[PDB]
Amino acid sequence: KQVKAAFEANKRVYESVLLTFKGVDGYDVYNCSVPFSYKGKTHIYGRVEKRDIWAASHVRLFEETGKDEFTAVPELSWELEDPYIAKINNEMIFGGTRVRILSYYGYFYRGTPDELTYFTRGPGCMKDIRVLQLQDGRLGVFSRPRVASIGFVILNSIDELGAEVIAKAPPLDILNAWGGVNQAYLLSSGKVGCIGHYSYEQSVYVNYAFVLDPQSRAITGAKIIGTKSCYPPCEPKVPLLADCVFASGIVMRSDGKVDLYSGVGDSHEGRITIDYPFKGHGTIIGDLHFPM
């Protein structure tokens, strides 16, 4: 990518840190959910795995206990990779990758961050499936067939979410390379702000943003918003992923900037402070603050 080289040359980063995680000594923590809030505290789900082994993750819930410091909450876990969250009608829709290696699936749970109940899943051998609540209240769904396209279909509600409709979602004009939506946002324009990953063959993963018009299905404001060099130095899982970052999501800041959270090198979780990435397409509507 000439775009990547331009980005590296032109990047605009105001703060750059690696999260510190406690209560999981011995493990890597990476490809987190976007942070969220519950019972008065900032929380995050993380993918917890030993650095020297593959496909051996579980998910933990972490509570903020200091600036960019997160402590695991005792005795809660999920048998998944790459956790991800959304708010639909005042509740959490939590998901992760479930691995059988025979097969894998996007698994979906609903409830409170404390009480999540499995309810549905995507098609076999598909991951990187994401949702949000649209302006009019229906459900936007993003799919990710790879064997790669990013697809999108509007459904009536979470009750219609399942493997078939997911699979048949028509493609969007976004991606020999691949990628995914990691966190979708509703914008005051009615349009959809996505934060995700753009990937190509080093397996290069950069943090990526674009805006979707859920009706015309037009794609705008596409851009690189982060790379590996944006975050402090750290060893990847393997050398091959020395130029890999896998988006978690953004958090709106009161000074008008955003904090971008990302998996780093498949071994750490980073946060960089960057300019609002959906400039000109409106402000973000709603939040990831969950009622108990």
UniProtKB/TrEMBL annotation:
UniProt-listed Gene3D superfamilies: Glycosyl hydrolase domain, family 43 (2.115.10.20)
InterPro entries listed in its UniProt record = Glyco_hydro_beta-prop_sf, MPT-1-like_LmxM
Q: Which domain of life is it from?
A: Eukaryota
Q: What is this protein called?
A: Uncharacterized protein
Source organism per UniProt: Leishmania major
What is the phylogenetic placement of the source species in the record? Eukaryota, Discoba, Euglenozoa, Kinetoplastea, Metakinetoplastina
